[PDB]
Amino acid sequence: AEAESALEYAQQALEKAQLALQAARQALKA
Amino acid sequence: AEAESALEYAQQALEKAQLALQAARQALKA
Amino acid sequence: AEAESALEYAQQALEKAQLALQAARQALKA
Amino acid sequence: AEAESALEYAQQALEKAQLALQAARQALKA
């Protein structure tokens, strides 16, 4: 639903973020 | 380019997260 | 250490963001 | 309020995140 779905996207996006996050981290530990 | 660019992508993800969130607090307000 | 560590901090911030968000979708569910 | 405040913290934290984000970025452009 309205906000439900805004959140669900917030979540989803938030995790792609933490995912890109680790990726850079690691690249940097290399 | 793994660190430099994992970074850029992250920020953008965050961007949409930040926006969805803002929409959320609005639907919320109702 | 500015890049390496700005990174760590970021992830953590994200962490609490991700958690608050999850709580939100729960209060939401109600 | 309940979720209102979870969001407000999500937001706040989310921006500290984007803030730490740029910080690392820049350090890396140095």
Token pair for residue B27?
């639907």
Contact status, residue A11 vs residue C21, Cβ threshold 8 Å: yes
Which chain D residue's Cα is nearest to B17? D14
Spatial distance between the Cα atoms of A23 and A15, rounded to a whole number of angstroms: 12
Domains contained in chain B, number: 1
- The owner of tokens 């140095």 is D30
Token pair for residue D17?
């995140």
D29 φ, ψ to 5°? -85, 20
Full domain range(s) for residue B17: 1-30
Token pair for residue A8?
């669900």
Determined by which method?
Answer: X-ray
Contact status, residue C24 vs residue D8, Cβ threshold 8 Å: no
Spatial distance between the Cα atoms of C7 and D21, rounded to a whole number of angstroms: 7
Spatial distance between the Cα atoms of B29 and D19, rounded to a whole number of angstroms: 26
Q: Do C10 and D26 touch (CB under 8 A)?
A: no
Which helix (H) or strand (E) segment holds residue B3: the answer is helix B3-29
**Residues in A touching B2 (Cβ below 8 Å):** 23-24, 26-27, 30
Spatial distance between the Cα atoms of C28 and C17, rounded to a whole number of angstroms: 16
Resolution (A): 2.5
